[PDB]
């Protein structure tokens, strides 16, 4: 009857039963209550994002007025005083990416106190223009705890499951791709390699095949947007921890680029290695005769050698380091650096080989993919020298998703690796590192400046010829 409905309605109006969506807001509120540091700021941006999403979906909900006010109080707390200076740019980002906004927010707090003026605007501009900082949903839902490894993706292979499985199992029986686990009931692979790491193993056909089917599954998950297979894998299948770690590291690298532009002594680099300094180094070099004396000039009051490699052949650097390893050793060199290999994926494999004398399948596949001579590693091990991988984790692609940010990111991250691995060897120990010529020079783009490897390590960029003649390459202005 109408009485029963009248009573039901009076009860409903007084104690509005809580939907799933409003429950999410209350849960998120508790997080604002309990969290500390940057977590509390992120939780506050995420509270706001939940409120906006709620009001959008329940336009005529009675709860909107009290949620709106809550949203303004939160916003007022966050952007009080000088923090309002960066508010418009940070809040616009917080609309889609609360954790990202919170990181920038912490930087803006410092900028309000007068640290690194300009960094905040730089981070905001990257967040808007770098395709890799765009909103990335990734894989949502429960992920297994069993895996002996950190999953980077959880990819539903659908129709490509059987092929992927075959080539994965062929790979695993040859010691490759061990950090991958199949769940047949959902046709998914839990995958412990990044897109870029896999690409570095495709000298092995079985990996190349597995990689091919992985990519097909990705393309089929998103046929409509123009996203590459790599970007699709992130936005649709990335583990959430992996996403955070990517976003975090990219923000770190932007700060790195910023600091390096102010703290690198480029004035002194140009005095030593341009103009008169260059003329003088070139003259002293040309008067020396043979490998021994050229080395002594190049390493005189310098921590190492930087040798350029050109796209195509000119593998003269790789050849030289191998054939003349003894002459390098006698001049104090104890470390050989290769931009050809990625530090995260390769260094554990390299180190285990130098310790045990046993080369893993995985390293053997990487060397093959990169066309590196196994004898370099044997000659290094026999000579007591360490080989170190110098590249970061992103695409070497001079084009990455259509902007300059991929280029700057790689140069930034490679600069950091170089400083950590090459810049402070024990007293007397020198290095020889081989870089592609693009990293040796500075990046002077409209979208930002990055010091060259040369600038960061206070060294000239070198070229070695078919007859072991060194020359100093002029700075790319």
Residue numbers in the entry: -4 to -1, 3596 to 4068
Q: What does the primary publication say about this deposited structure?
A:
To date, more than 10 MARTX effector domains have been annotated, including several domains of unknown function in Vibrio species, among which the fifth domain of a MARTX toxin from Vibrio vulnificus CMCP6 is a Ras/Rap1-specific endopeptidase (RRSP). RRSP catalyzes sequence-specific cleavage of the Switch I region of the cellular substrates Ras and Rap1 (18, 19) that are critical for a myriad of signal transduction events, including innate immune defenses. Structural and functional bioinformatics and cell biological studies revealed that RRSP belongs to the TIKI superfamily, and it is composed of an N-terminal region mediating its localization to the plasma membrane and a C-terminal region responsible for cytotoxicity. In this study, we determined the crystal structure of an RRSP from the sepsis-causing pathogen V. vulnificus CMCP6 (VvRRSP), and we demonstrated that it is a metal-independent TIKI family endopeptidase.
